[PDB]
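Why this split exists: single-chain examples teach little about how molecules sit against one another. For that reason, every record in the complexes split bundles all components of an assembly together and asks for one structure covering all of them. Below is a record exactly as it appears in the raw files.
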Amino acid sequence: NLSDFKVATWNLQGSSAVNESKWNINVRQLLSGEQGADILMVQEAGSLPSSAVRTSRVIQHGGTPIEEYTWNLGTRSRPNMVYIYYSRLDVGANRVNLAIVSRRQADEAFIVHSDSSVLQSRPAVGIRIGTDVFFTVHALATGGSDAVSLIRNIFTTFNSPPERRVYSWMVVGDFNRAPANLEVALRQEPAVSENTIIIAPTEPTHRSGNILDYAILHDAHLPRREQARERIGASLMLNQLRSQITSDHFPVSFVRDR
Amino acid sequence: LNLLSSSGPNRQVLPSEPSNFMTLMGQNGALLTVWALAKRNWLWAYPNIYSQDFGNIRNWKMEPGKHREYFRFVNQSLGTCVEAYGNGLIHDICSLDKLAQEFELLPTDSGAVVIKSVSQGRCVTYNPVSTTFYSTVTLSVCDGATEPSRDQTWYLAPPVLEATAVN
Amino acid sequence: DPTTYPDVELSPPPRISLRSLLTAQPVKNDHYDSHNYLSTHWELIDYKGKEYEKLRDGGTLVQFKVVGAAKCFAFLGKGTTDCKDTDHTVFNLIPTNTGAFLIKDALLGFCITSHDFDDLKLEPCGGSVSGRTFSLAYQWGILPPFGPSKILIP
Ligand SMILES: [Br-]
Ligand SMILES: [Br-]
Ligand SMILES: [Br-]
Ligand SMILES: [Br-]
Ligand SMILES: [Br-]
Ligand SMILES: [Br-]
Ligand SMILES: [Br-]
Ligand SMILES: [Br-]
Ligand SMILES: [Br-]
Ligand SMILES: [Br-]
Ligand SMILES: [Br-]
Ligand SMILES: [Br-]
Ligand SMILES: [Br-]
Ligand SMILES: [Br-]
Ligand SMILES: [Br-]
Ligand SMILES: [Br-]
Ligand SMILES: [Br-]
Ligand SMILES: [Br-]
Ligand SMILES: [Br-]
Ligand SMILES: [Br-]
Ligand SMILES: [Br-]
Ligand SMILES: [Br-]
Ligand SMILES: [Br-]
Ligand SMILES: [Br-]
Ligand SMILES: [Br-]
Ligand SMILES: [Br-]
């Protein structure tokens, strides 16, 4: 079950000027302790931590870049390893990149595009661990207009392969639009709308006061129109912080209700 | 100690437990803390420099509460929980069924947070300026004030514990 | 810069207050009146030069910059000097298992410590600090900037 995992997301807002310190201050804190995330999605990742190491694994199975790295959150004598799946989309300035940090190795990766358009939208990048698939997204700044077709394409990818019919999937990231605004728009795709559930905080996730970071998921264990039975709640991940949050976005976690 | 024993790598000490705790620090550096150890006594806020002898009763483990978006605080040393009571906070036996032990933290635009009692609908308030060792901790209307005699902003900070470098 | 995704604005450096976990006092700059809150604020910027890699000890090189000025924290004058004087302004963040940070200078590999009120020095702390344990005198909190703030409203 997706609910077995502690999933989180954070838009790091990286840049040439500040990037490395953000991974070492905030990302490290989001992954540590008993309540640290098992899977963390990152947007605007910039460059990976300088100590991250590229593995020999090849997942590049298309035009969109995706690479696997390992990163040691501990010391050389007491390692505490995580994998990082990195999609360096921003070849222009190397800042608008996507990443997924996972304790467990991905069995497979997936890249799903939204509808063709003249806008430079970003694809959803994800990893499958067993029967659960996790995506990181960063929708367009102007109302995340690419979000509905992105969600629909992800849906058809798994729910239209034989083995994919039992997969649960979760799309997590910066949707750039209110949860209710996305919810209404998705109704234009009845099958998608009825097979998914938006899980989001009711507290701001950005310093503008807006709620822009959350998740949408499909739990294969639940029937159509019954996804609201999901026992996964969204919350600003404040229990992990021991420092200033170095971006204008607050990390958000998705954890099973206790 | 040996990093390599005769038959294999030997595990060095590097505690993960400290990662689970933190302190709630006011703008004046004062940390929300138990003072009188018996259950149901009032909580206060003392900076580390005036409370070294308090030990781990100054550290808390922040966990999600029973309800979505709320948190509860468990004392590192005593295992009791922060609880809204009357016009302040006390610590008492933990129970996921006690709404008074659940708090909503509201982020501010500086990255600090305001702590709101869900049962009372009031925020944790304190006086940054004090003629004594501590700030008095109360509950009052959530206006996000940041004055010398009344402030409601807190920082989610590292616990007061020996730290081990993980570089 | 020429990012591939122009819908995404470039974000400026994060604002912080740097506090000793022992004294809880924020390190101040002299660019603002001591009673003005901006005197407790710093912009955290990453140092990109490669001349201090030998003693980096796996930490992150940074500078603590004054808001609105090309000045950076340093053990010189009244607490700051020109940011271009990297030997005195580039420091090194060392993460810990608690979220606190140890801070070394990039040039000497010494540690910044504070054992008492208004005490701040850069002292030898041996070789690599990896896996070693330290008292609060060596610990620093990179925290929200001191001063007013507004509760975010959706
Ligand atoms: Br742990
Ligand atoms: Br592709
Ligand atoms: Br590695
Ligand atoms: Br080591
Ligand atoms: Br694995
Ligand atoms: Br796309
Ligand atoms: Br954006
Ligand atoms: Br909404
Ligand atoms: Br099943
Ligand atoms: Br429905
Ligand atoms: Br849980
Ligand atoms: Br041995
Ligand atoms: Br250990
Ligand atoms: Br401990
Ligand atoms: Br007592
Ligand atoms: Br008692
Ligand atoms: Br008392
Ligand atoms: Br939980
Ligand atoms: Br609830
Ligand atoms: Br203890
Ligand atoms: Br009473
Ligand atoms: Br001060
Ligand atoms: Br200047
Ligand atoms: Br400037
Ligand atoms: Br030395
Ligand atoms: Br306010």
